[PDB]
């Protein structure tokens, strides 16, 4: 039996084993190749699942253990993409990254994560949440040397995502999450076509869908950026009204230690809300009570049966020890509030 009230989850990614990849980095090269890597990825999935279960996470992910990066791995499996043709581009309208190049017409040929999801589905009866990159974030994490159009390419990616997502649903995934950190930047594009591309990505799915929009991984570039954002981070106000009208079921957001006004959650009243109650941009471990405090504040704007305690973003850049402490705090804080709501203490 699954957790009916305040079920916990994370944004998706968790640290990989030392023998599989370099610690505490983004885009780590794989330390195994060939059949050893095939086995290692699945063993890492099993170990990550166990870590999530031990920490009391109710809705589990792959720990993103089988991918190098939450955006570029998916892109690299597509036709029309040159994996080893790298360019430095400014991503998120702000900072530089080494990204793959679109060299021709894009298409999905073989499935990407479906065999992984079938494998994970056999390991547990708990709900499974699998993240894919959203169409906008995809076009913002590559160099387009063919379409020469963010919108045209994003449309093609929406179609491809829909194919992958539908097959992940067939594999038994319960929640398909689309990672759209780009939505906290490109407001005009979100309004003109980003929502439409997200709708195309989710068309015909019967499982629950989520969109994740945050202020990024725990890296210096982002913590520096946060220091410039002022007293109120109101980026969500630009996109929440349209997300409210969309067919997305769950909105995953950053909240803990942020300056996002909590009353912005009223704009999505009726949606399920994955409320980030863990700051993945500090190594300081939250107390259970600090997590509980964020969840209590969120209950002013979200019905208890729609509140999904979560992390502000993924944890692949953190150490295993920090991650363990944070996930334990998340589950412990959720339980504090769950017990209050049920008059158990």
The footprint of ligand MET (CB under 6 A) covers: 11-13, 64, 70, 131, 179, 181, 212, 214, 216-217, 313-314, 316
Looking at the Cβ atoms of 99 and 337, the one nearer to ligand MET is: 99
Residue 145 CB partners (closer than 8 Å, separation 6+): 101, 102, 103
Which of Zn ion, ligand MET, none sits in contact with 316, Cβ below 5 to 8 A by type? ligand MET
How many residues of this chain bind Zn ion (CB under 5 A)? 2
Q: How far is the CB of 181 from Zn ion (least distance, A)?
A: 5
Looking at the Cβ atoms of 133 and 333, the one nearer to ligand MET is: 133
Among 20, 211, 214, 274, binds Zn ion (CB under 5 A): 214
175 binds Zn ion (CB under 5 A): no
Q: How far is the CB of 145 from ligand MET (least distance, A)?
A: 24
Q: How far is the CB of 95 from Zn ion (least distance, A)?
A: 15
Confirm if 195 and 155 have CB atoms less than 8 A apart: no
Confirm if 99 and 91 have CB atoms less than 8 A apart: yes
| 3-state percent helix, strand, coil for the chain, nearest multiple of 5 | 40, 20, 40
Residue 218: how many other CB atoms lie within 10 Å: 20
201 binds Zn ion (CB under 5 A): no
Residue 44 CB partners (closer than 8 Å, separation 6+): 16, 17, 20, 63, 65, 66
Q: Indicate if the alpha-carbon torsion angle 300, 7, 115, 21 is positive or negative.
A: positive
Looking at the Cβ atoms of 178 and 193, the one nearer to ligand MET is: 178
Residue 314 CB partners (closer than 8 Å, separation 6+): 10, 11, 12, 13, 14, 64, 70, 217, 280
Looking at the Cβ atoms of 185 and 214, the one nearer to Zn ion is: 214
Residue 58 CB partners (closer than 8 Å, separation 6+): 2, 3, 7, 8, 9, 126, 127
Q: How far is the CB of 155 from Zn ion (least distance, A)?
A: 23
Q: How far is the CB of 182 from ligand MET (least distance, A)?
A: 9
313 binds Zn ion (CB under 5 A): yes
Q: How far is the CB of 219 from ligand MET (least distance, A)?
A: 9
Using alpha carbons, select from 129, 130, 242 the residue that is nearest to residue 183. 242
Looking at the Cβ atoms of 66 and 299, the one nearer to ligand MET is: 66
Task: Name the residue with the smallest CB distance to ligand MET.
Answer: 314
Binding-site ranges for Zn ion (CB under 5 A): 214, 313
């Amino acid at each position: 039996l699954n957790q009916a009230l305040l079920p916990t989850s994370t944004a998706g990614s968790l640290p990989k084993p030392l023998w599989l990849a370099e610690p505490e980095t983004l885009w780590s090269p794989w330390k195994l190749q060939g059949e050893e890597l095939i086995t290692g990825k699945h063993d890492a999935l099993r170990l990550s699942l166990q870590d999530q279960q031990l920490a009391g996470i109710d809705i589990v992910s792959d720990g993103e253990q089988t991918r190098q990066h939450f955006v570029t791995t998916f892109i690299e499996h597509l036709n029309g993409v040159d994996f080893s043709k790298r360019k430095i581009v400014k991503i998120r309208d702000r900072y530089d990254a080494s990204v793959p190049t679109v060299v021709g017409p894009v298409s999905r040929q073989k499935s990407v994560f479906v065999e992984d999801a079938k494998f994970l589905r056999k390991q547990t009866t708990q709900p499974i949440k699998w993240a894919l990159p959203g169409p906008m974030t995809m076009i913002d994490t590559l160099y387009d040397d063919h379409y020469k159009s963010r919108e045209k390419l994003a449309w093609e990616f929406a179609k491809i995502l829909n194919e992958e997502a539908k097959e992940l649903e067939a594999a038994g995934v319960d929640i398909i999450q689309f990672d759209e950190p780009a939505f906290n930047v490109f407001f005009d594009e979100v309004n003109d076509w980003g929502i439409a591309c997200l709708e195309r990505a989710i068309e015909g799915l019967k499982c629950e869908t989520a969109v994740h929009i945050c202020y990024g991984y725990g890296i210096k570039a982002n913590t520096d950026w946060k220091k410039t954002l002022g007293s109120e981070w109101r980026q969500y106000e630009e996109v929440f009204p349209k997300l409210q009208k969309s067919n997305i079921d769950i909105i995953s957001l950053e909240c803990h230690n942020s300056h996002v006004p909590m009353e912005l959650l009223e704009l999505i009243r009726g949606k399920k809300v994955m409320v980030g109650a863990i700051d993945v941009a500090t190594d300081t471990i939250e107390t259970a009570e600090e997590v509980a405090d964020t969840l209590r504040k969120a209950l002013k704007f979200v019905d208890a049966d729609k509140l999904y305690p979560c992390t502000n973003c993924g944890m692949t850049p953190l150490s295993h020890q920090v991650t363990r402490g944070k996930l334990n705090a998340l589950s412990a804080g959720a339980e504090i509030v769950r017990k209050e709501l049920l008059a158990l203490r």
